mmCIF file of C-alpha atoms in Angstrom:
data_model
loop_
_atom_site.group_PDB
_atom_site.id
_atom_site.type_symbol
_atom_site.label_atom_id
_atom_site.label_comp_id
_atom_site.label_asym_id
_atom_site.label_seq_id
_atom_site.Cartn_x
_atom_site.Cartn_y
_atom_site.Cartn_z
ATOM 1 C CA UNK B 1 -44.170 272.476 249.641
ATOM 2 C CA UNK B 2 -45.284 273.857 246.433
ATOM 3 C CA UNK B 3 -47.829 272.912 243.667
ATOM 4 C CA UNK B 4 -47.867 273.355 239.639
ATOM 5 C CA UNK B 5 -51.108 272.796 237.160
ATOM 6 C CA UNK B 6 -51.529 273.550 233.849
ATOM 7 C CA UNK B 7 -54.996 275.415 232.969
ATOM 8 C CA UNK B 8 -56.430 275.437 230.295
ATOM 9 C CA UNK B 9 -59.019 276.999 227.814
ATOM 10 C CA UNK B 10 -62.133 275.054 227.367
ATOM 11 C CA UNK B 11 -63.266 276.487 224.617
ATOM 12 C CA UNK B 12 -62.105 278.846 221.209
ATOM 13 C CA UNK B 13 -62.725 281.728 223.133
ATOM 14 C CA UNK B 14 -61.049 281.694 225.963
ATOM 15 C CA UNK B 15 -64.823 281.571 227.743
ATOM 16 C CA UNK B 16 -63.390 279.950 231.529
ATOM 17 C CA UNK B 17 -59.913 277.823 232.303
ATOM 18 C CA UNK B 18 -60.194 273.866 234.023
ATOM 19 C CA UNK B 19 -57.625 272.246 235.860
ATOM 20 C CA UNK B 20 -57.214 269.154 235.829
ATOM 21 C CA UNK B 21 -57.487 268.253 240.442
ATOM 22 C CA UNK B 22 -57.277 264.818 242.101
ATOM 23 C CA UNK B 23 -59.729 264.317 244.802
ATOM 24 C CA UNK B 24 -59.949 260.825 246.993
ATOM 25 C CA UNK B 25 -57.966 257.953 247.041
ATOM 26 C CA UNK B 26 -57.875 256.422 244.524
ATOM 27 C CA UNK B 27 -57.573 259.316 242.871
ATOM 28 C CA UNK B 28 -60.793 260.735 241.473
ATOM 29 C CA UNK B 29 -59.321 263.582 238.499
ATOM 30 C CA UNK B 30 -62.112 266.057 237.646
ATOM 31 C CA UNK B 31 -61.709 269.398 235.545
ATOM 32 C CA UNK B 32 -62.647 272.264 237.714
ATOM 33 C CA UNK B 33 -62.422 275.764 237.194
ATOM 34 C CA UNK B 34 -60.046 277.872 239.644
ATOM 35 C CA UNK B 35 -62.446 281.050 240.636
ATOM 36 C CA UNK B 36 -60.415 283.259 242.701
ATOM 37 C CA UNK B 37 -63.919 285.336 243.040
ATOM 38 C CA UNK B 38 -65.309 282.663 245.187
ATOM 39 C CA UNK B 39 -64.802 280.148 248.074
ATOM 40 C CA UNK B 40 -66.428 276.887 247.670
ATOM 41 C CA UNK B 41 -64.682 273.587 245.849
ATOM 42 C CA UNK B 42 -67.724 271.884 244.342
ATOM 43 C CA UNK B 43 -68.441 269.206 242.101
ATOM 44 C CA UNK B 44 -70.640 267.362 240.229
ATOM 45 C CA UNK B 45 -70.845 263.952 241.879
ATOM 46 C CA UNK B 46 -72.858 260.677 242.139
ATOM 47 C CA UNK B 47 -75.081 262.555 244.377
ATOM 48 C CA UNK B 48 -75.980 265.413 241.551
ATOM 49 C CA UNK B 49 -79.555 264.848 240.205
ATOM 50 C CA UNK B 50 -79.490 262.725 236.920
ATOM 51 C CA UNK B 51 -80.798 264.800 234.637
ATOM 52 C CA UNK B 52 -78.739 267.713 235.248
ATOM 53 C CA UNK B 53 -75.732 265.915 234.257
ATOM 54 C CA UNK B 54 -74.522 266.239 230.568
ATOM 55 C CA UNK B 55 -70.765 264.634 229.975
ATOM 56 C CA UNK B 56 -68.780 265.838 232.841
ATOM 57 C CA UNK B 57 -66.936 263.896 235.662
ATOM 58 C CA UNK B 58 -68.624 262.838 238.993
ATOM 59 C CA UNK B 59 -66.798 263.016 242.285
ATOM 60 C CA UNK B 60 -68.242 259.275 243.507
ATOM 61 C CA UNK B 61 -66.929 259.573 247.198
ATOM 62 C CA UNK B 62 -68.874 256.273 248.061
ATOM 63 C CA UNK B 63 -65.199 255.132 246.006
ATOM 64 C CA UNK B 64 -62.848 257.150 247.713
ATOM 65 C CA UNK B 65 -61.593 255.543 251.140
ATOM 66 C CA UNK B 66 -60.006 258.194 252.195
ATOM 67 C CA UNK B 67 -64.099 260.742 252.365
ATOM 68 C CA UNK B 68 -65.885 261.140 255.401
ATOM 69 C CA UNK B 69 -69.252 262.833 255.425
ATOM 70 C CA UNK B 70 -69.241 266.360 257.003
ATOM 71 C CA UNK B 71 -72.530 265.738 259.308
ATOM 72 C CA UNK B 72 -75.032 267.961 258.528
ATOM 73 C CA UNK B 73 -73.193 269.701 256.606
ATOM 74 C CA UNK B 74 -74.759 271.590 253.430
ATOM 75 C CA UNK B 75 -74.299 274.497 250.838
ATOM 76 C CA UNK B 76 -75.886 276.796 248.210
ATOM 77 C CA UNK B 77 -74.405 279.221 246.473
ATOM 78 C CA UNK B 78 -75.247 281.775 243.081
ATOM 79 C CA UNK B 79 -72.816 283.275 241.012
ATOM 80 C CA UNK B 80 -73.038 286.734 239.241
ATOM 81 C CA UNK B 81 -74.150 285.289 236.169
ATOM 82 C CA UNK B 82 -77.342 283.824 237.911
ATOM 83 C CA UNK B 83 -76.172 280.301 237.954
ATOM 84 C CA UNK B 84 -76.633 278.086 241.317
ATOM 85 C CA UNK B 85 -75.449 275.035 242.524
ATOM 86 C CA UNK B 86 -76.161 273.249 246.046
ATOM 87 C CA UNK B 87 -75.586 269.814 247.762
ATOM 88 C CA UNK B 88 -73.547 268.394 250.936
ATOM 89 C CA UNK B 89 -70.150 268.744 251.776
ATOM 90 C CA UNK B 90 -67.492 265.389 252.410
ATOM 91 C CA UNK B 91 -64.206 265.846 253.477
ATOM 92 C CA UNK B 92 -61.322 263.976 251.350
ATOM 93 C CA UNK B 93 -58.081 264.530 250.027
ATOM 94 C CA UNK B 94 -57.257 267.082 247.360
ATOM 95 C CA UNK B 95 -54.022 267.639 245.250
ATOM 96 C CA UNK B 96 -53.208 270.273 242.933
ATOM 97 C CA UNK B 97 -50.079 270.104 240.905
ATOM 98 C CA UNK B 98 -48.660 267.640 243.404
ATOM 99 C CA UNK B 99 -49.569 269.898 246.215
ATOM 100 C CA UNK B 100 -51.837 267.593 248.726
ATOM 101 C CA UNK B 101 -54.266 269.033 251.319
ATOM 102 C CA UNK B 102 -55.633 266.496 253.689
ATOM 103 C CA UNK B 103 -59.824 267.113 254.873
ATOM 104 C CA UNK B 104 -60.355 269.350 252.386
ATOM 105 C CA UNK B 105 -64.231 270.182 252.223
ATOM 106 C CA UNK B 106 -65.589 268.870 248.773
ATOM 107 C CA UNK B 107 -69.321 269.618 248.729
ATOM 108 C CA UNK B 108 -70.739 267.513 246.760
ATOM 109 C CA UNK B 109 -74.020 268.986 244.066
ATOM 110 C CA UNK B 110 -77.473 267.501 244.525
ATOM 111 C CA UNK B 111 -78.627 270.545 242.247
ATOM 112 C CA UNK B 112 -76.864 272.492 239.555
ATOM 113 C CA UNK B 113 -78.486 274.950 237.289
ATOM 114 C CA UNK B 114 -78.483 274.648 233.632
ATOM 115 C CA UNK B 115 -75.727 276.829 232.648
ATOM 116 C CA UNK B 116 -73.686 274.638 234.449
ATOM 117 C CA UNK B 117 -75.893 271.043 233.156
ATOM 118 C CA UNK B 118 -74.723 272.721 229.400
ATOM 119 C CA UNK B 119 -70.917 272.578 230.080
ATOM 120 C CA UNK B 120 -69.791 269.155 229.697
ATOM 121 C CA UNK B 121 -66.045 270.345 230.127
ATOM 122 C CA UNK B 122 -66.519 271.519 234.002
ATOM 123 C CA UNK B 123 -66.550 269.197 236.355
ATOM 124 C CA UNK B 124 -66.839 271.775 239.375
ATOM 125 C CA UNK B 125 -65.551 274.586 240.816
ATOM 126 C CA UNK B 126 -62.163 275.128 243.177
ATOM 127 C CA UNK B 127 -62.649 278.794 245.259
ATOM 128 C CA UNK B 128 -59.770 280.912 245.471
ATOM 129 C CA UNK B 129 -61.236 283.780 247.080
ATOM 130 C CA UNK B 130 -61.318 284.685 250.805
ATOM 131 C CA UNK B 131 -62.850 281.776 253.063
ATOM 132 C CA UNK B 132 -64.790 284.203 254.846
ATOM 133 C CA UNK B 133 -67.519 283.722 251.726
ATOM 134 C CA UNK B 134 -67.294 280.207 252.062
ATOM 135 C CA UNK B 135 -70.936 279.259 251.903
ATOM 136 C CA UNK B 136 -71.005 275.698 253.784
ATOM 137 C CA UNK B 137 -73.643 275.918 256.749
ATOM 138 C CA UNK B 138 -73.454 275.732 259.879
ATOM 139 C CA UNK B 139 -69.934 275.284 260.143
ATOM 140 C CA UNK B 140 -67.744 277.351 257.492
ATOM 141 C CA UNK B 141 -65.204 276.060 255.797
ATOM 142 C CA UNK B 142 -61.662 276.816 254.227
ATOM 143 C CA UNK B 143 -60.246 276.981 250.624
ATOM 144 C CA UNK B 144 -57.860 274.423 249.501
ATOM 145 C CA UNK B 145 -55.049 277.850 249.289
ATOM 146 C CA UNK B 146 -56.435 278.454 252.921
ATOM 147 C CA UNK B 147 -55.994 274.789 253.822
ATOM 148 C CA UNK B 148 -52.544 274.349 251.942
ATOM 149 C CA UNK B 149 -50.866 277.749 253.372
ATOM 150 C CA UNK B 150 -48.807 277.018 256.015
ATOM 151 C CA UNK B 151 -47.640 274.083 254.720
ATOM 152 C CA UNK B 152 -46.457 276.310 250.942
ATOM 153 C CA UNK B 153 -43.019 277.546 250.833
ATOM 154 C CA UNK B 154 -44.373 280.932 250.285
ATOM 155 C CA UNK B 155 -47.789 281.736 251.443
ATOM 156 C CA UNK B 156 -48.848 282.751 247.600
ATOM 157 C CA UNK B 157 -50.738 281.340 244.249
ATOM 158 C CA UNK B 158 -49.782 282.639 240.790
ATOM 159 C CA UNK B 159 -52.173 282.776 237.943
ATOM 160 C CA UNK B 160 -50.631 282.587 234.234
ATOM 161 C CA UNK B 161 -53.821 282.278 231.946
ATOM 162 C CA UNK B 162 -53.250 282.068 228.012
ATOM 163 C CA UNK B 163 -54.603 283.526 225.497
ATOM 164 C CA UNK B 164 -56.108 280.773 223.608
ATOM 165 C CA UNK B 165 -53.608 278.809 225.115
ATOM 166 C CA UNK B 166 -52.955 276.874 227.920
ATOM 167 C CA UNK B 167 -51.598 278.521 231.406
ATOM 168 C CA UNK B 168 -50.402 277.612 234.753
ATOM 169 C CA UNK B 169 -51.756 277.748 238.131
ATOM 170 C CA UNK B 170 -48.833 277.712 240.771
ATOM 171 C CA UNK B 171 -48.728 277.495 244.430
ATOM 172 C CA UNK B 172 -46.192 278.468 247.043
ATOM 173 C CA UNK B 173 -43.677 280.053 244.867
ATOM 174 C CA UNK B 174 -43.285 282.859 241.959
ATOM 175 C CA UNK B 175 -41.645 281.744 238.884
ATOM 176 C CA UNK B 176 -39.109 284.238 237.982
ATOM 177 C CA UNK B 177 -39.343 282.938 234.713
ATOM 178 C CA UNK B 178 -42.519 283.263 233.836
ATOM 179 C CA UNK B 179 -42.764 286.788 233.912
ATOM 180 C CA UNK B 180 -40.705 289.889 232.427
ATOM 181 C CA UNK B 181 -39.292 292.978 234.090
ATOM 182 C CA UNK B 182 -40.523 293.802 237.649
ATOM 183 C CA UNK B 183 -43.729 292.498 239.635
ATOM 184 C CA UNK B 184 -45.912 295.783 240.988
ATOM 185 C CA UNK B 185 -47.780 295.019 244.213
ATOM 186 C CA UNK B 186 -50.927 296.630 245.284
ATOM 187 C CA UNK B 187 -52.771 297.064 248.337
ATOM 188 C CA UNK B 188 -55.726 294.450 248.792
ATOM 189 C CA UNK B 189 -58.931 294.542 250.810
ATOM 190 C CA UNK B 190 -60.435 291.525 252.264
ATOM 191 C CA UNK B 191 -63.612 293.562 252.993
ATOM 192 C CA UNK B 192 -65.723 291.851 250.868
ATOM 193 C CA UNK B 193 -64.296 288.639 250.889
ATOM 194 C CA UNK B 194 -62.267 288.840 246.966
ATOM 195 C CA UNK B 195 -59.246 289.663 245.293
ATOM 196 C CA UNK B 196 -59.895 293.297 245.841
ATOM 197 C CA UNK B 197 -57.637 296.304 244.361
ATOM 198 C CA UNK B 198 -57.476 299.511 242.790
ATOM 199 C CA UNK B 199 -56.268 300.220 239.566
ATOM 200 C CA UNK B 200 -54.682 303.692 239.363
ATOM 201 C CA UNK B 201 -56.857 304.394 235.631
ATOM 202 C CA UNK B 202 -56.321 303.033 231.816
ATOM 203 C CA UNK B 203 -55.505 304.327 228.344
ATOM 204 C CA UNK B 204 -57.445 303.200 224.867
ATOM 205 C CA UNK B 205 -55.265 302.320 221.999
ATOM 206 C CA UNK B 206 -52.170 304.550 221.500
ATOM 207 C CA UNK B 207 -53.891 307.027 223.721
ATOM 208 C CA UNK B 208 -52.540 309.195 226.500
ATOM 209 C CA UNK B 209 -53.222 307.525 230.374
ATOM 210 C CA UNK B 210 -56.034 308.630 232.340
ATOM 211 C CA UNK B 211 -55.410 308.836 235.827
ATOM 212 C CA UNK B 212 -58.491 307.232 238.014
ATOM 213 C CA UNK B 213 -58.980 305.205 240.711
ATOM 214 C CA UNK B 214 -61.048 302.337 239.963
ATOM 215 C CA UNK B 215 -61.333 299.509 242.729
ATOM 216 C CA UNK B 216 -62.297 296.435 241.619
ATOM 217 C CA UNK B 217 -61.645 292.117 241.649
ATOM 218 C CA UNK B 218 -59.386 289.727 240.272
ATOM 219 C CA UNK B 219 -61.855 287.185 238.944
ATOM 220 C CA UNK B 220 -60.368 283.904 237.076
ATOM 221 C CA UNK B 221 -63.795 282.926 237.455
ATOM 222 C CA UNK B 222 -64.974 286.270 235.219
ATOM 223 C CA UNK B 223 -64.479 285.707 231.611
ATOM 224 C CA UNK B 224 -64.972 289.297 230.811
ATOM 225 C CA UNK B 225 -63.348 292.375 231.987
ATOM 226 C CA UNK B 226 -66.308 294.868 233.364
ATOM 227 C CA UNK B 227 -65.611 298.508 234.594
ATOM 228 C CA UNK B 228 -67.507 301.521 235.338
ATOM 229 C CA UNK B 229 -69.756 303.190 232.597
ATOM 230 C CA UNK B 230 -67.668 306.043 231.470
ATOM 231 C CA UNK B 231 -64.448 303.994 230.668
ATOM 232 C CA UNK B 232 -66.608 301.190 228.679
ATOM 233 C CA UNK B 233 -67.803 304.409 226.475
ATOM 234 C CA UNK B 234 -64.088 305.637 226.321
ATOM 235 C CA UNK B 235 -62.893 302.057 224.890
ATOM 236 C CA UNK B 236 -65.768 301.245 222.200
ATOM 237 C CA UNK B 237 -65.635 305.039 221.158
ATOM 238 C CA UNK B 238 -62.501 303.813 219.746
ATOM 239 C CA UNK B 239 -64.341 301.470 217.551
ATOM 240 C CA UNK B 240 -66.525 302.482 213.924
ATOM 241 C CA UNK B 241 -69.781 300.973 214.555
ATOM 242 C CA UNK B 242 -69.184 299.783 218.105
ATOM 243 C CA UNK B 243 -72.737 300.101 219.797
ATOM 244 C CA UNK B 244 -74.412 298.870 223.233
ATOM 245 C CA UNK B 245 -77.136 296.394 222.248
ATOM 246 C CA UNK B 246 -79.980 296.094 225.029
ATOM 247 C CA UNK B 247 -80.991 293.177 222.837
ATOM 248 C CA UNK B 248 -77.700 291.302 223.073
ATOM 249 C CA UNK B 249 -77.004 292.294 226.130
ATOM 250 C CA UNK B 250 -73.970 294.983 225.845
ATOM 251 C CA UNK B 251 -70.982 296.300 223.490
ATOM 252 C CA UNK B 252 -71.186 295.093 220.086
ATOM 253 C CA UNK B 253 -68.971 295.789 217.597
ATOM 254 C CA UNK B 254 -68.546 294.559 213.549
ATOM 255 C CA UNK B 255 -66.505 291.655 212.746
ATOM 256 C CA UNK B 256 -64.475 293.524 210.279
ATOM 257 C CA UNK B 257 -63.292 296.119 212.751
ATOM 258 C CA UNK B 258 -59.436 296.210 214.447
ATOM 259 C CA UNK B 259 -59.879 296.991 217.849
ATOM 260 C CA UNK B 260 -57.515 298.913 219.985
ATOM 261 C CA UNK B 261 -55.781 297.654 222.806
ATOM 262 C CA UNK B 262 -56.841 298.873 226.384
ATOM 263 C CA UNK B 263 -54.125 299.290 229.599
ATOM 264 C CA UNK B 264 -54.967 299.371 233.064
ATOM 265 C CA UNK B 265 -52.521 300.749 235.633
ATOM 266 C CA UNK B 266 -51.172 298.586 238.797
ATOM 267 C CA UNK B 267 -50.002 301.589 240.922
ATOM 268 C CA UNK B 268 -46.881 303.249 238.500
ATOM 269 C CA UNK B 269 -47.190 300.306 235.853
ATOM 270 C CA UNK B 270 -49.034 299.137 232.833
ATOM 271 C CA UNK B 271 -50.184 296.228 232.063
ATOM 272 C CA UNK B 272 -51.406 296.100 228.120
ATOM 273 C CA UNK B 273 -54.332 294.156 226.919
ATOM 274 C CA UNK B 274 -54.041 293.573 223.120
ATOM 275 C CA UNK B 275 -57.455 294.432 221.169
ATOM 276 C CA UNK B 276 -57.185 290.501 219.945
ATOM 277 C CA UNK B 277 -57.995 289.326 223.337
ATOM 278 C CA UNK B 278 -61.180 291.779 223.583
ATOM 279 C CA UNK B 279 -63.106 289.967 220.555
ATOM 280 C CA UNK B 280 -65.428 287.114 221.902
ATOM 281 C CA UNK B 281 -66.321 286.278 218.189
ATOM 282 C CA UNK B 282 -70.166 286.565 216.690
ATOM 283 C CA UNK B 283 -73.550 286.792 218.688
ATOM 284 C CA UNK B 284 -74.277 283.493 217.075
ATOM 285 C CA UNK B 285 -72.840 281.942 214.185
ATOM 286 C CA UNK B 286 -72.477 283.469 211.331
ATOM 287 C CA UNK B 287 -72.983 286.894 212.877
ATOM 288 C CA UNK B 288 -71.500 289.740 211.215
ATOM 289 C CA UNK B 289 -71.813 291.658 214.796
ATOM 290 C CA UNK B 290 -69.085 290.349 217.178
ATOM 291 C CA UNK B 291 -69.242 290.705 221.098
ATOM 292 C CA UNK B 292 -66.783 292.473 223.062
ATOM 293 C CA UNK B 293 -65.068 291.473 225.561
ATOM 294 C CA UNK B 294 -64.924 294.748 227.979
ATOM 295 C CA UNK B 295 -68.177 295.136 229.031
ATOM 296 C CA UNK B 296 -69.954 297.947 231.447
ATOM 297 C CA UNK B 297 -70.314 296.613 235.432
ATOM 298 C CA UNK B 298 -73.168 299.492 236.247
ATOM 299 C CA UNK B 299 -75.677 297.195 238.060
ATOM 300 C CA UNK B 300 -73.389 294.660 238.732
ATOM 301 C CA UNK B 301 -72.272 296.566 241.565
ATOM 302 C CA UNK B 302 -68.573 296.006 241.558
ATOM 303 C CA UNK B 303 -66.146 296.328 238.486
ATOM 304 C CA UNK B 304 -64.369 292.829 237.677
ATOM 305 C CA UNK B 305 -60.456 292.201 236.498
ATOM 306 C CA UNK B 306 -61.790 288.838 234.872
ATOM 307 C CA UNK B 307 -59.771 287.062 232.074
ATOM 308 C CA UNK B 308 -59.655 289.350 229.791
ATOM 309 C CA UNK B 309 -57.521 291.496 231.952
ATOM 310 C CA UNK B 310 -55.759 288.884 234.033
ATOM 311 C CA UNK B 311 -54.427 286.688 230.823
ATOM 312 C CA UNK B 312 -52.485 289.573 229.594
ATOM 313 C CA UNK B 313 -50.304 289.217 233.377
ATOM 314 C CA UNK B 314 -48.800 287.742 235.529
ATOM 315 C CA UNK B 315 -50.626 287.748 238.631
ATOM 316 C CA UNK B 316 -49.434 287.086 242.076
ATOM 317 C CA UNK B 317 -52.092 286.089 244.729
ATOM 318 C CA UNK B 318 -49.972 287.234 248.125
ATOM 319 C CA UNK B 319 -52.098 285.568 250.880
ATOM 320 C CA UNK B 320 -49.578 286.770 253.819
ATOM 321 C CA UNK B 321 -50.866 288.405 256.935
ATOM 322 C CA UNK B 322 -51.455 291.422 254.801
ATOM 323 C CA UNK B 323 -52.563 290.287 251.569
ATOM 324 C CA UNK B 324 -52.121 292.184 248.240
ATOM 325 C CA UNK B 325 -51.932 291.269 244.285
ATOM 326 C CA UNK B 326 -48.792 291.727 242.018
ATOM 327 C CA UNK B 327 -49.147 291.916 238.209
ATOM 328 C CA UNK B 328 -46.539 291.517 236.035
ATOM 329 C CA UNK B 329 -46.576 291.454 231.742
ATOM 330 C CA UNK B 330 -45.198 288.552 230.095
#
C-alpha cells in the first residue's frame, strides 16, 4: 500500500507544515504537523483543558466507534523550543493520504502549553522520528510510519515541503517525478532516536565549498536551519549589517539587504538553499531588522536540518533494516 498528503504552510512564513489526517470512524480530520524529530501522534481533544484551547480541532474519541482506551496509559513530552504537552493515549484508526493504520496510539492532551494554546491552525502533532523516543508510559508505543511499514510497498516516507507553498508527504514509494537528477543517500544513525546524518560541509553565496563534517537531524518539525557556531558566522558575514542580537534572540539582519544563498553537501552533492528562503520577515511588524532563518545550535546541543534546509529537497526517509536519508533538488 502507499499513502499521499498534501502539506501545507500555515502561515506567510513558512513557520511549520499541517496535514490534513483522519482519525476514528467516522472520520475525525484534524491538521497536525508531521515532526520527523519526534515520536508521539498527539492531539488536542475533548479531554484537553478548556482554556487552553483557542480555534483548533478536537479529537472527541467518545465519537469514534472504532477508540479503545489504552489502560493506564499516559504521556508527557517537551520539545526544543520549551513547549509541553501531556494527556492519555486511545487507540483508533488513522489514515494518511489513503494509507490506513489500524490501533494506532492517539494520546489524547489534558495539558498543552501556550505556544501551542496560540496556534489555532495545529490540531496536534504526528511523530516521524524513531519509536524508540516514543514517550507513552509504561508501555511504549509505535509511529504511524512504524505501524504502517510492512504493510507500504516500500518501507520509506518522502518529504516535499514548499516554499511558501504547499508540499507533499508520501508514503511507501518515491516519486520519480517529483525530483530532478539523482537521489544521494547517506548513512543514518538511530542512536539518538532522529533522522540523524552528516553533511559533508557548505558554501555561502557564490563561494568556494568547505569541506566539514557536520552531523546533524532532519527536523520537519524545526522551522529553522541551526548549525555549529563557526558556519552561522561564515553565512551572516556575507550580509552588511547582519548582527547576533542577544535581545532578539540570534542573527538579525536589515530588511533591505539580498542575502546569499547557503549549500550543504549530502556526501558528493549539493543541495542549494536560495537566500529568499532564509528571511523570516521583521522582529515585529513594521521592523526594519528582519530575522534570519539560519540560526547558531551552540547550546542546543545538536545542529538541526529543519525547513529551511529540507524545503529546498527532496528528502527520502529510508526506514529499511538499515535506515539512511536521500536528498534530492527539485
Amino acid at each position: 500500500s502507499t499513502g499521499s498528503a498534501t502539506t501545507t504552510p500555515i502561515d506567510s512564513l513558512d513557520d511549520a507544515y499541517i496535514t490534513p489526517v483522519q482519525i476514528g470512524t467516522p472520520a475525525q480530520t484534524l491538521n497536525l504537523d508531521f515532526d520527523t524529530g519526534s515520536s508521539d501522534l498527539w492531539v488536542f481533544s475533548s479531554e484537553t483543558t478548556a482554556s487552553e484551547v483557542d480555534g483548533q480541532t478536537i479529537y472527541t474519541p467518545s465519537k469514534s466507534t472504532t477508540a479503545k482506551l489504552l489502560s493506564g496509559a499516559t504521556w508527557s513530552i517537551s520539545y526544543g523550543d520549551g513547549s509541553s504537552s501531556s494527556g492519555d493515549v486511545y487507540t483508533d484508526t488513522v489514515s494518511v493520504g489513503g494509507l490506513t493504520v489500524t490501533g494506532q496510539a492517539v494520546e489524547s492532551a489534558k495539558k498543552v502549553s501556550s505556544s501551542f494554546t496560540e496556534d489555532s491552525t495545529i490540531d496536534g502533532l504526528l511523530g516521524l522520528a524513531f519509536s524508540t523516543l516514543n514517550t507513552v508510559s509504561p508501555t511504549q508505543q509505535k509511529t504511524f510510519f512504524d505501524n504502517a511499514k510492512a504493510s507500504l510497498d516500500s518501507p520509506v516516507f518522502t518529504a516535499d515541503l514548499g516554499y511558501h507553498a504547499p508540499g507533499t508527504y508520501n508514503f511507501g514509494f518515491i516519486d520519480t517525478t517529483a525530483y530532478t537528477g539523482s537521489i544521494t543517500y547517506t548513512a543514518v544513525s538511530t542512536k539518538q532516536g532522529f533522522w540523524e546524518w552528516t553533511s559533508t560541509g557548505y558554501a555561502v553565496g557564490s563561494g568556494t565549498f568547505k569541506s566539514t563534517s557536520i552531523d546533524g537531524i532532519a527536523d520537519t518539525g524545526t522551522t529553522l536551519l541551526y548549525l555549529p557556531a563557526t558556519v552561522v558566522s561564515a553565512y551572516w558575514a556575507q550580509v552588511s549589517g547582519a548582527k547576533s542580537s542577544s535581545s532578539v534572540g540570534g542573527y538579525v539582519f536589515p530588511c533591505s539587504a539580498t542575502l546569499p544563498s547557503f549549500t550543504f553537501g549530502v556526501g558528493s552533492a549539493r543541495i542549494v538553499i536560495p537566500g529568499d528562503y532564509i528571511d523570516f520577515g521583521p522582529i515585529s511588524t513594521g521592523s526594519s531588522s528582519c530575522f534570519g532563518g539560519i540560526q547558531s545550535s551552540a547550546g542546543i546541543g545538536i545542529n538541526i536540518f529543519g525547513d529551511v534546509a529540507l524545503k529546498a529537497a527532496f528528502v527520502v526517509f529510508n526506514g529499511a533494516t538499515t535506515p539512511t536519508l536521500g536528498f534530492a533538488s527539485k
